[PDB]
Design a protein around this ligand. Structure first.
Ligand SMILES: C[C@H](CC(=O)O)NCC(=O)O
Ligand SMILES: C[C@H](CC(=O)O)NCC(=O)O
Ligand SMILES: [Fe+2]
Ligand SMILES: [Fe+2]
Lengths: 294, 294
């Protein structure tokens, strides 16, 4: 019964009714994926799933990868990444209020996955949602001088700013954790732009949260002001979130968000209050790498 | 009944018998302090003290200052800093295995105290002790080219390497803690050498743990190799601890160590094993600042 209702023209997003991951056909999945690659966000409606069913759904779209730090993992389905501030039997499950910064998922890793799935569990009614920027479209809207300046350049991405302290880190000297992070997840180099392997779009692959430097073709660093100007032009420095590149995606119970993790950067919008909020995440590799240079 | 038995000649240290902090006279305290300033380490023998009595003893020597991070504090006497890996009723008291790096206490703070007191509580029999270097004597033993090179220079000291993660830091992004530490305890500048206000000695006031840069009189940084050469010449890079500047101080139950926190740097020697070890610390300001430029 799957019906895809794409937003008109250039507007981002699509709504998907009648989707049952257990009965959807191969053609259903291919159509769904194609909507993800061209409309960037697919909101599956009326999803009422167990953790095992959410994983099964992600497995229809590609190969799931479990987040590399175990404290994020759901206790029954290790492939599920949990953002939660609601204890269960008094125990912290997952990590509170993940993602409160512009990023693409796994951008700081050598081999980022193409598709992110979010299944919200507990949703505040007030100021909850996810901000998105389409960095393909943000590239196209760059001034021509900036496009020329970044041609041929490379960016370095690192988790070093937003790596979250883990329970066993208590009482350790902070430099030991800083060095461990650099050792286990060293900064990764990507071309500043790449060609989206599904659509052919040019994507400006940077985020304020993870992108820490930009450099010329030899790997010689450039003034970080160049990075700051790219963040500013693309809307990532606008603390009011009114910039034209920014799309605010809300969601209601039963929604399941699936989105293009090559093209989009995003940032969790949370309440300014201690209100319960829980989301489950599955992240999958599709039929191609992030770009064909991987 | 206090009797001070100073080690002969130039050898470091003294033993103190018959000391009762509650009955010792003003002349006893003045003699004890003078031994601390000239012999650098005073081991008080046969001390059998409650936490309140240990604080009272420190108060005979000067004005106690409580460590600025509360997780180190003894639960009854906030002025007592606790190094402990032995839980009490299951609860972590103090901080495990503090000081496993060369430093002077509070060297990273604007106004370091002159006297450190250690009252060991649980002592492993095997490889336990405290390494010390007399940085006055280490200065005098520097080659003449090095003495000239550091003349007029300044060093910056920071807790940024060995600040210990606190329980409430769990799940925070690490950059937020890094920035908090820089904000609350910014790096402090001291002259590279100063005149010991009690003895007139020239002290080379650096430690591998806290000293992060050296700079000329204008505050222009110098090559950090200059700092590395000072650490190397003074014995702080010798991982075998056999260098001639190094003194290993052991202790037995009832010992109470009191030492010159202007002249000495030190480093905890712990077992290579998970063996119980507990020490209490009181730190006091005496009649003068660290040096007369404070
Ligand atoms: C550091 C972030 C997780 C978080 O915000 O806690 N990494 C998420 C990801 O890249 O998939
Ligand atoms: C960071 C150190 C404490 C420790 O080793 O945990 N400061 C001790 C002091 O300066 O008095
Ligand atoms: Fe994310
Ligand atoms: Fe110390």
């Amino acid at each position: 019964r799957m019906q895809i209702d794409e937003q008109p023209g250039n507007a981002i997003g699509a709504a998907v009714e009648g989707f049952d991951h257990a009965t959807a056909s191969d053609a259903d999945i291919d159509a769904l994926k194609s909507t993800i690659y061209t409309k960037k966000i697919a909101v599956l409606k009326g999803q009422d799933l167990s953790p095992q069913q959410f994983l099964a759904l992600g497995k229809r779209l590609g190969r799931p990868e479990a987040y590399y730090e175990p404290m994020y993992q759901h206790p029954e389905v290790t492939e599920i990444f949990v953002s939660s501030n609601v204890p269960e039997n008094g125990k912290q499950i997952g990590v509170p209020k993940t993602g409160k910064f512009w990023h693409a998922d796994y951008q700081f890793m050598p081999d980022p996955f193409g598709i992110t799935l979010i299944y919200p569990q507990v949703i505040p009614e007030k100021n909850r949602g996810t901000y998105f920027i389409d960095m393909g479209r943000a590239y196209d809207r760059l001034p021509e001088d900036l496009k020329k300046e970044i041609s041929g350049t490379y960016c370095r991405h690192s988790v070093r700013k937003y790596f979250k302290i883990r329970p066993h880190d208590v009482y350790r000297p902070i430099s030991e954790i800083i060095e461990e992070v650099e050792r286990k997840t060293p900064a990764v180099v990507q071309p500043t732009t790449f060609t989206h392997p599904m659509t052919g779009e040019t994507v400006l692959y940077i985020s304020e949260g993870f992108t820490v430097g930009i450099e010329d073709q030899d790997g010689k660093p450039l003034d970080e002001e160049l990075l700051k100007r790219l963040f500013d032009a693309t809307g990532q420095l606008d603390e009011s979130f009114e910039h034209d590149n920014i799309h605010l995606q809300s969601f209601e119970q039963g929604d399941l968000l699936v989105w293009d993790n090559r093209s989009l950067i995003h940032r969790a919008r949370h309440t300014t209050t201690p209100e319960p909020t829980v989301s489950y995440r599955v992240t999958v590799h599709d039929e191609r790498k992030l770009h064909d240079g991987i």
